[PDB]
Symmetry: C3
Subunit: 177 residues, 3 copies
Amino acid sequence: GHMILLKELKELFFLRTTYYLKKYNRSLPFGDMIVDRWDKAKLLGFGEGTSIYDSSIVLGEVKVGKDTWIGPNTILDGSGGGLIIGSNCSISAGVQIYTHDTVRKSLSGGKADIDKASTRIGSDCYLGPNTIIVKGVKIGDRVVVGANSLVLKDIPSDCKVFGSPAVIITDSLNYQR
Amino acid sequence: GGHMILLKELKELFFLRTTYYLKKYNRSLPFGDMIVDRWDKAKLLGFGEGTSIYDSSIVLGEVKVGKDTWIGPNTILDGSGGGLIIGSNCSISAGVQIYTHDTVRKSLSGGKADIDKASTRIGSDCYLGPNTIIVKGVKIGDRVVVGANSLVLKDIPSDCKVFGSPAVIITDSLNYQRN
Amino acid sequence: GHMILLKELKELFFLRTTYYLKKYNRSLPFGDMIVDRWDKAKLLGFGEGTSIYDSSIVLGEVKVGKDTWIGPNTILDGSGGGLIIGSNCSISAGVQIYTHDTVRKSLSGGKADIDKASTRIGSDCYLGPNTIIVKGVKIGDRVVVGANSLVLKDIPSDCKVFGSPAVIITDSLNYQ
Ligand SMILES: CC(=O)SCCNC(=O)CCNC(=O)[C@H](O)C(C)(C)COP(=O)(O)OP(=O)(O)OC[C@H]1O[C@@H](n2cnc3c(N)ncnc32)[C@H](O)[C@@H]1OP(=O)(O)O
Ligand SMILES: CC(=O)SCCNC(=O)CCNC(=O)[C@H](O)C(C)(C)COP(=O)(O)OP(=O)(O)OC[C@H]1O[C@@H](n2cnc3c(N)ncnc32)[C@H](O)[C@@H]1OP(=O)(O)O
Ligand SMILES: CC(C)(COP(=O)(O)OP(=O)(O)OC[C@H]1O[C@@H](n2cnc3c(N)ncnc32)[C@H](O)[C@@H]1OP(=O)(O)O)[C@@H](O)C(=O)NCCC(=O)NCCS
Ligand SMILES: O=S(=O)(O)CCCN1CCN(CCO)CC1
C-alpha cells in the first residue's frame, strides 16, 4: 500500500538517475528530477531562458529578467518590498537574497516587528557561491560578488566586491573582455 | 509503464501545488516543502508551539526546540553527539548548521579514529544569521546575535553580539532588544 | 487523482519519519527518506562504503574513492574536465567543489565561454561546512580545510588551511 508507493518512488529514482546520467551527465536530487528548471521559471513569471532549481525558495514579489541562472539551495526573498533581478545573471548555489530581517523580533522576545526593505540587482551580474545579500541593497549592472560575501550596502555598476562585509576591491572591466 | 505514469502524476501534483501556493501564500517552494508542512513537521518532532521547520532541514539525534522558533531551509540540527537544545523565539536562518559531533580525526587518520562528540545548546531570543556554523560543545546564552557567515567555536554569554570566522564578541546586544 | 496522491505522499512521509526516528534517531527531508545514501553512491560509480545524500548535485565526471561521506546540500562539479576525490574523505554539508565558472559569461552579457579546469582532492581529507573549492585546485592527502573556507589555490599534503580566502595555518599531523 504505502510500501508499494515507496517501492515505486524508489524505482522512479533509480530510473530518473539513469536518465539524467545518460542524457545530461548529472545526478540530481529527487525533487530536481521531477520538476523542470525552465518550466518552474516560466510558471513564476521570470524572463525566457531563466532557469531555477527545485531546491530554490522564492517568496513574495520577485522579478527576474531573461537568461538568468538561479542555482540550487538559493533564497530569493521579495517578501519585504519586492526583489528585482536583471538579465544574464549567475545566481550561484547557496546564494541568499533578502528583503526582510527578524533580528529585533527575536532579540525582543517576539515583540518588535519584522524589518523590511526592497532589494534590486542589475543585469550581467555574477553572485558567487554562498553570497548573502541583505535587505535594502541596490546592486548595479555588471557587478561581480565573490563567493562567501555578505553584502550590506549598495554596489555601483562595473565593480568587483567580496568579503564579510563585502568591500569594493576594484572594477569588473576585465571580466567583460 | 507505471514508472512514467507516476512521473506524470508527480509533475501534475507539482504544477497544482505550485499554482496553489502562489495564489494563497504568495511563494514557490521545493517539491518536498509542498508535501511536508513546516508546522506539522515541528509538531511531530516534539517542538514548542508556533515553531516551524522546513522539509529541507535535517534533524539528527536528540534535538529539542522551544516555542515560536523559526528553523529555516537547508539547515542542519545535529544532536547526535549528546543532545542539541534551542530555545524560544529564535531565528535559525537558512543554511545554519549546528553540530554536536565531527569527523576530522576519523578522516585524517584514514578511518581509524572515533567520531568526536559534545552536546550543544542555544538559549531563547537568539538570532543566527544565514550560513552560521555552530560546532560541538558550544553553549550560547539568551538574547545573542550571531551575524551571517559566522563560525562559532566557543560559548557565547547572554546579551552579546558576535560575528566573524571565528566569531568574536563585538559588543552587547541590548540595543536590539528594545521596544 | 491529485488530492489522493498528495494524501498518500503525506501518509508515507509520516510513516517514514516515524520509522527513521525509531530506527536511526533522525528526521530527514522527504527526498532523503526515498533515496538510500549508499545505493545512490553505488549507482554513481563511487567506491565501496561511500555515501551521498539526495540533496547533493553531481555534474560531469566525478570519481570518489572508498569510505567517503558526501553530505547534504553539496555540489560536486566535475563538468569542466573532471573532479577526483580520494578515500575516507569528509565532505561536510554545504561544501561546493567546482571545475567551471561563469563570471566572464555573465559579465559579458552571455557572450563569453564558460571557463574550465579540473580539480583534485586526495584521500584522508576533511572539508568543513560550507567550504568552497574552485576550479583548477589540487588538494593533497591528509588535508584539513576548516569551515567557511574558500580554496583558491593548491594545498599540499598534511596541511591545515582555513579562511576566505584559505591560507595555510599549520600541518595536519595532530589529527592523524
Ligand atoms: C530569520 C530570517 O531568515 S531573517 C533574514 C536573513 N537575514 C539577513 O538578511 C540579515 C543578515 N545580516 C546579519 O546577519 C547581520 O550580521 C546582523 C543584522 C545580524 C547584524 O548587523 P548589524 O551589525 O546590525 O548591521 P550594521 O550594518 O549596522 O553593521 C555594523 C558593523 O558590523 C559589521 N557587521 C555586521 N554584521 C557582520 C557580519 N555578519 N560579519 C562581519 N561584519 C559584520 C558591519 O560591516 C559594520 O562594520 P563597521 O562597524 O566597520 O561599520
Ligand atoms: C562528517 C562531517 O561533516 S563533521 C560535522 C561538521 N563539522 C564541524 O562541525 C566542525 C567544524 N570545524 C571546523 O571546520 C574547524 O575549522 C576544524 C575542526 C577543522 C579545525 O579546528 P581546529 O583548528 O582543530 O580548532 P581550534 O579551536 O583548536 O582552532 C585553532 C585556532 O584556529 C582558529 N580556527 C579553527 N578553525 C577555523 C576556521 N574554520 N576558520 C577560522 N579560524 C579557525 C581558531 O579560532 C583558533 O584560533 P586561536 O588560536 O586564535 O584561538
Ligand atoms: C569572483 C571570483 C572569481 C574572484 O576571484 P579572482 O579575483 O578572479 O581570483 P584572484 O585570486 O585573482 O582574486 C584576487 C584577490 O582577491 C582575493 N579573493 C578573490 N575572491 C575572494 C573572495 N570571494 N573572498 C575573499 N577574497 C577573495 C584573492 O585571495 C586575492 O587576494 P590577494 O590580493 O591577497 O592575492 C571569486 O571570488 C569566486 O567567487 N570564485 C568562485 C567561483 C565558482 O566556483 N563559481 C561556481 C560556478 S558558476
Ligand atoms: O545550462 S546548464 O549548464 O544547466 C545545462 C547545459 C546545457 N543545457 C542547455 C539548455 N538546455 C535546455 C534549455 O531550455 C538543456 C541543456
